[PDB]
Amino acid sequence: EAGITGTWYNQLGSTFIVTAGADGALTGTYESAVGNAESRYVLTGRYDSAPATDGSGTALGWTVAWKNNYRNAHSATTWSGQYVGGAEARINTQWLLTSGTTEANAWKSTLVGHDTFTKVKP
Amino acid sequence: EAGITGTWYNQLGSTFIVTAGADGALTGTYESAVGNAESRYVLTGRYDSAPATDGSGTALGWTVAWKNNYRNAHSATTWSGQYVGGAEARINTQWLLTSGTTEANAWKSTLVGHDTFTKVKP
Amino acid sequence: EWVHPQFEQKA
Amino acid sequence: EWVHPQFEQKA
Fold first, then answer.
1. Of the candidates B3, B55, B56, which has an alpha carbon nearest to the alpha carbon of residue B26?
2. Residues on chain D touching A107 (C-beta within 8 angstroms)
3. Which whole-number Å values give the CA distances from A89 to A5, A47, A117, B107, in the listed order?
4. How far, in Å, CA of A78 to CA of A93, rounded?
5. Are the CB atoms for A85 and A55 separated by under 8 Å?
6. Is B30 annotated as belonging to a binding site?
7. Is B107 part of any known ligand binding site?
8. Alpha-carbon separation of residue A9 from A12, B55, D2 (angstroms)
9. Which residues are in the Avidin-like domain (chains A, B)?
10. CATH 2.40.128.30 assigned to A1-122
11. Which residue in C6, C7, C9 has the most chain B C-beta atoms within 10 A of its own C-beta, making it the best mutation to test that interface?
Protein backbone atom coordinates (compact mmCIF):
# COMPACT_ATOMS: atom_id res chain seq x y z
CA GLU A 1 0.00 0.00 0.00
CA ALA A 2 2.97 2.30 0.65
CA GLY A 3 3.89 2.51 -3.07
CA ILE A 4 7.62 2.36 -2.30
CA THR A 5 8.59 -1.27 -2.91
CA GLY A 6 10.13 -1.68 -6.34
CA THR A 7 12.70 -0.20 -8.69
CA TRP A 8 13.60 3.45 -8.70
CA TYR A 9 15.76 5.41 -11.14
CA ASN A 10 17.48 8.76 -10.65
CA GLN A 11 18.11 11.24 -13.39
CA LEU A 12 21.78 10.17 -14.05
CA GLY A 13 21.52 6.39 -14.56
CA SER A 14 21.51 4.83 -11.10
CA THR A 15 18.95 2.23 -10.05
CA PHE A 16 17.84 1.07 -6.65
CA ILE A 17 15.53 -1.83 -5.81
CA VAL A 18 13.90 -1.66 -2.40
CA THR A 19 11.44 -3.44 -0.21
CA ALA A 20 9.35 -1.34 2.16
CA GLY A 21 8.61 -3.59 5.13
CA ALA A 22 5.44 -3.46 7.16
CA ASP A 23 7.54 -2.34 10.17
CA GLY A 24 9.10 0.77 8.52
CA ALA A 25 12.18 -0.93 7.12
CA LEU A 26 13.73 -0.10 3.80
CA THR A 27 16.06 -2.81 2.51
CA GLY A 28 17.59 -3.30 -0.92
CA THR A 29 20.40 -2.55 -3.32
CA TYR A 30 21.72 0.56 -5.03
CA GLU A 31 23.44 0.19 -8.39
CA SER A 32 25.42 2.87 -10.18
CA ALA A 33 25.02 3.68 -13.87
CA VAL A 34 27.88 1.23 -14.64
CA GLY A 35 25.35 -1.59 -13.97
CA ASN A 36 27.74 -4.47 -13.06
CA ALA A 37 28.16 -6.58 -9.85
CA GLU A 38 31.06 -4.30 -8.82
CA SER A 39 28.62 -1.40 -9.02
CA ARG A 40 25.95 -2.68 -6.56
CA TYR A 41 25.81 -1.81 -2.87
CA VAL A 42 23.63 -2.58 0.11
CA LEU A 43 20.89 0.04 0.88
CA THR A 44 19.27 0.26 4.28
CA GLY A 45 16.86 2.82 5.78
CA ARG A 46 13.48 3.65 7.29
CA TYR A 47 10.17 5.16 6.21
CA ASP A 48 6.96 6.36 7.81
CA SER A 49 4.71 3.29 7.54
CA ALA A 50 1.61 5.31 8.57
CA PRO A 51 1.78 8.61 6.63
CA ALA A 52 -0.73 11.41 6.89
CA THR A 53 -3.86 11.02 4.78
CA ASP A 54 -4.10 14.77 3.88
CA GLY A 55 -2.14 14.65 0.58
CA SER A 56 1.29 14.87 2.28
CA GLY A 57 4.21 12.78 1.09
CA THR A 58 5.73 9.87 2.99
CA ALA A 59 8.96 10.71 4.81
CA LEU A 60 11.90 8.36 4.44
CA GLY A 61 15.67 8.07 4.36
CA TRP A 62 18.38 5.56 3.57
CA THR A 63 22.11 4.98 3.63
CA VAL A 64 24.57 3.33 1.28
CA ALA A 65 28.13 2.76 2.43
CA TRP A 66 30.32 2.58 -0.68
CA LYS A 67 31.96 -0.74 0.11
CA ASN A 68 31.04 -4.02 -1.58
CA ASN A 69 33.07 -7.19 -2.26
CA TYR A 70 34.82 -5.51 -5.22
CA ARG A 71 35.51 -1.90 -4.21
CA ASN A 72 35.69 0.52 -1.29
CA ALA A 73 35.39 4.27 -1.66
CA HIS A 74 35.64 4.86 2.16
CA SER A 75 32.44 6.89 2.23
CA ALA A 76 28.73 6.71 2.80
CA THR A 77 25.75 8.62 1.45
CA THR A 78 22.50 9.33 3.15
CA TRP A 79 19.37 10.34 1.22
CA SER A 80 16.63 12.17 3.10
CA GLY A 81 13.32 12.86 1.39
CA GLN A 82 9.72 11.93 0.76
CA TYR A 83 7.72 9.66 -1.51
CA VAL A 84 5.01 11.46 -3.49
CA GLY A 85 2.40 9.06 -4.91
CA GLY A 86 0.02 9.47 -7.85
CA ALA A 87 0.21 9.05 -11.64
CA GLU A 88 3.99 9.57 -11.90
CA ALA A 89 5.22 8.67 -8.40
CA ARG A 90 8.48 10.22 -7.28
CA ILE A 91 10.93 10.14 -4.40
CA ASN A 92 12.40 13.62 -3.90
CA THR A 93 15.61 13.69 -1.90
CA GLN A 94 18.60 15.58 -0.66
CA TRP A 95 21.80 13.72 0.07
CA LEU A 96 25.00 13.98 2.16
CA LEU A 97 28.09 12.05 1.09
CA THR A 98 30.69 11.80 3.85
CA SER A 99 34.15 10.41 3.11
CA GLY A 100 36.49 9.23 5.77
CA THR A 101 39.17 11.89 6.26
CA THR A 102 41.96 12.84 8.61
CA GLU A 103 41.15 15.68 11.01
CA ALA A 104 43.20 18.04 8.83
CA ASN A 105 41.09 17.13 5.77
CA ALA A 106 37.71 17.17 7.57
CA TRP A 107 36.78 20.39 5.84
CA LYS A 108 36.41 18.37 2.61
CA SER A 109 34.59 15.46 4.21
CA THR A 110 30.93 16.11 3.32
CA LEU A 111 29.42 16.79 -0.06
CA VAL A 112 25.79 17.75 -0.53
CA GLY A 113 23.42 17.31 -3.45
CA HIS A 114 19.99 16.10 -4.51
CA ASP A 115 18.26 13.34 -6.44
CA THR A 116 14.80 12.75 -7.86
CA PHE A 117 13.79 9.12 -8.38
CA THR A 118 10.98 7.77 -10.60
CA LYS A 119 9.62 4.31 -11.42
CA VAL A 120 10.55 4.88 -15.14
CA LYS A 121 14.10 5.60 -16.46
CA PRO A 122 15.12 9.08 -17.64
CA GLU B 1 21.52 47.73 18.86
CA ALA B 2 22.07 45.36 15.88
CA GLY B 3 25.17 43.92 17.66
CA ILE B 4 26.76 42.58 14.46
CA THR B 5 29.32 45.21 13.50
CA GLY B 6 32.78 44.17 14.63
CA THR B 7 35.13 41.21 14.79
CA TRP B 8 34.03 37.62 14.95
CA TYR B 9 36.09 34.46 15.37
CA ASN B 10 35.19 30.86 14.50
CA GLN B 11 36.38 27.77 16.27
CA LEU B 12 39.28 27.19 13.77
CA GLY B 13 40.82 30.64 14.36
CA SER B 14 39.47 32.48 11.33
CA THR B 15 38.56 36.10 11.84
CA PHE B 16 36.01 38.29 10.09
CA ILE B 17 35.49 41.99 10.53
CA VAL B 18 32.12 43.27 9.36
CA THR B 19 30.07 46.43 9.20
CA ALA B 20 26.30 45.99 9.46
CA GLY B 21 24.90 48.94 7.52
CA ALA B 22 21.62 50.64 8.37
CA ASP B 23 20.21 49.43 5.01
CA GLY B 24 20.78 45.66 5.68
CA ALA B 25 24.28 45.51 4.13
CA LEU B 26 27.09 43.32 5.45
CA THR B 27 30.52 44.38 4.20
CA GLY B 28 33.96 43.41 5.41
CA THR B 29 36.83 40.98 5.29
CA TYR B 30 37.39 37.33 6.11
CA GLU B 31 40.84 36.18 7.13
CA SER B 32 41.82 32.58 7.49
CA ALA B 33 43.58 31.39 10.62
CA VAL B 34 46.98 31.97 8.85
CA GLY B 35 46.44 35.72 9.48
CA ASN B 36 48.44 37.44 6.66
CA ALA B 37 47.49 39.66 3.66
CA GLU B 38 47.31 36.67 1.25
CA SER B 39 44.82 35.09 3.71
CA ARG B 40 42.30 37.95 3.56
CA TYR B 41 39.25 38.07 1.27
CA VAL B 42 36.29 40.34 0.67
CA LEU B 43 33.06 39.42 2.55
CA THR B 44 29.67 40.70 1.35
CA GLY B 45 26.15 39.86 2.53
CA ARG B 46 22.82 40.92 3.98
CA TYR B 47 21.05 40.87 7.34
CA ASP B 48 17.63 41.61 8.77
CA SER B 49 17.96 45.22 9.89
CA ALA B 50 14.60 45.11 11.81
CA PRO B 51 14.54 41.81 13.65
CA ALA B 52 11.68 40.58 15.80
CA THR B 53 11.60 41.83 19.40
CA ASP B 54 10.39 38.48 20.90
CA GLY B 55 13.80 36.96 21.70
CA SER B 56 14.41 35.64 18.17
CA GLY B 57 17.79 35.87 16.55
CA THR B 58 18.71 38.09 13.63
CA ALA B 59 18.90 36.29 10.28
CA LEU B 60 21.86 36.97 8.02
CA GLY B 61 24.12 35.54 5.36
CA TRP B 62 27.30 36.38 3.50
CA THR B 63 29.58 35.21 0.71
CA VAL B 64 33.34 35.07 0.27
CA ALA B 65 34.77 34.28 -3.16
CA TRP B 66 38.25 32.84 -2.59
CA LYS B 67 40.11 35.16 -4.92
CA ASN B 68 42.23 38.04 -3.72
CA ASN B 69 45.19 39.90 -5.28
CA TYR B 70 47.53 37.02 -4.33
CA ARG B 71 45.64 33.73 -4.81
CA ASN B 72 42.57 32.19 -6.45
CA ALA B 73 40.98 28.94 -5.24
CA HIS B 74 38.17 29.13 -7.89
CA SER B 75 35.50 28.72 -5.24
CA ALA B 76 33.05 30.63 -3.06
CA THR B 77 31.50 29.98 0.37
CA THR B 78 28.17 31.13 1.63
CA TRP B 79 27.33 31.19 5.34
CA SER B 80 23.66 31.26 6.35
CA GLY B 81 22.66 31.77 9.96
CA GLN B 82 21.53 34.03 12.72
CA TYR B 83 23.01 36.40 15.29
CA VAL B 84 22.06 35.58 18.87
CA GLY B 85 22.68 38.48 21.28
CA GLY B 86 23.14 38.44 25.06
CA ALA B 87 26.01 37.87 27.49
CA GLU B 88 28.13 35.84 25.04
CA ALA B 89 26.81 36.85 21.65
CA ARG B 90 27.18 34.35 18.81
CA ILE B 91 26.57 33.96 15.09
CA ASN B 92 25.50 30.40 14.37
CA THR B 93 25.90 29.33 10.74
CA GLN B 94 25.83 26.60 8.17
CA TRP B 95 27.97 26.98 5.09
CA LEU B 96 28.17 25.76 1.48
CA LEU B 97 31.49 25.85 -0.34
CA THR B 98 31.14 25.51 -4.09
CA SER B 99 34.17 25.04 -6.34
CA GLY B 100 34.14 25.68 -10.07
CA THR B 101 34.12 22.28 -11.80
CA THR B 102 33.61 20.66 -15.16
CA GLU B 103 30.22 19.06 -15.66
CA ALA B 104 31.73 15.60 -15.12
CA ASN B 105 33.16 16.66 -11.71
CA ALA B 106 30.06 18.56 -10.58
CA TRP B 107 29.21 15.74 -8.16
CA LYS B 108 32.07 17.01 -5.98
CA SER B 109 31.29 20.70 -6.45
CA THR B 110 29.68 21.56 -3.12
CA LEU B 111 30.83 20.89 0.38
CA VAL B 112 28.72 21.60 3.46
CA GLY B 113 29.63 22.39 7.05
CA HIS B 114 28.99 24.67 9.98
CA ASP B 115 30.67 27.45 11.95
CA THR B 116 29.97 29.17 15.30
CA PHE B 117 31.37 32.65 15.63
CA THR B 118 31.97 34.58 18.86
CA LYS B 119 33.38 37.99 19.81
CA VAL B 120 36.32 36.27 21.67
CA LYS B 121 38.98 33.94 20.07
CA PRO B 122 38.66 30.22 20.91
CA GLU C 1 39.90 11.78 -13.11
CA TRP C 2 38.24 9.52 -10.51
CA VAL C 3 34.47 9.73 -10.20
CA HIS C 4 32.88 8.41 -7.03
CA PRO C 5 30.70 5.29 -7.48
CA GLN C 6 27.51 7.14 -6.67
CA PHE C 7 27.96 9.15 -9.95
CA GLU C 8 30.14 6.94 -12.15
CA GLN C 9 29.00 6.40 -15.77
CA LYS C 10 29.75 3.63 -18.25
CA ALA C 11 33.03 4.12 -20.21
CA GLU D 1 48.42 18.23 1.17
CA TRP D 2 46.51 21.31 -0.02
CA VAL D 3 44.08 22.88 2.44
CA HIS D 4 41.47 25.26 1.04
CA PRO D 5 41.97 28.88 2.28
CA GLN D 6 38.79 28.89 4.37
CA PHE D 7 40.39 26.27 6.65
CA GLU D 8 44.17 26.68 6.32
CA GLN D 9 46.03 26.87 9.61
CA LYS D 10 49.28 28.40 10.90
CA ALA D 11 52.20 25.91 10.70
1. B3
2. 3-4, 6-7
3. 12, 16, 9, 25
4. 10
5. no
6. yes
7. yes
8. 8, 46, 36
9. 1-122
10. yes
11. C7
